[PDB]
Amino acid sequence: SLGTYVPGDITLVDSYGNEFQLKNLKGKPIILSPIYTHCRAACPLITKSLLKVIPKLGTPGKDFWVITFTFDPKDTLEDIKRFQKEYGIDGKGWKVVKAKTSEDLFKLLDAIDFRFMTAGNDFIHPNVVVVLSPELQIKDYIYGVNYNYLEFVNALRLARGEGHHHHHH
């Protein structure tokens, strides 16, 4: 929900096995991308689309964090490492992570109003990228798989508390 905060005590584990809390990423805007590692339908589209917009916007790990995270609780460190290498993701400025436990996962998906359901051997789920302020406040949602540059620029400006002086609020 726009304006609500993602809990900072959520524990994530990156594809190198480095454990951290979401609060540890405070201080820069955060771009969050829920996927799952065995997702052959929408998730390659989302990630490939991000790969083609992120370089326009700035440098991951400097201007903002990019966090691809898996929502499949069966995904292991092996799985996310495979995903990282698959898409040539650097793993530091742009991380691929899993939630440490199901509580970390629940909490994260609950905050961003994300729900998934079974469809045979895969999941039915929304296509969404979430943009957080440096304080973990949800500032924008960008839906779909066909991203445009302007929508990301606008989202990052909102994340930084910019782009608002055209209006009295």
164 is in an annotated binding site: no
Q: What is the three-class DSSP state of 35?
A: strand
35 beta partners: 70
Read off the DSSP letter of residue 120.
T
Cβ 23 vs Cβ 136: under 8 Å: yes
**125 vs 156: CA distance, rounded Å:** 24
167 is in an annotated binding site: no
Read off the DSSP letter of residue 75.
-
169 is in an annotated binding site: no
Cβ 99 vs Cβ 10: under 8 Å: yes
Binding site members for Cu cation: 39, 43, 125
Binding site members: 39, 43, 125
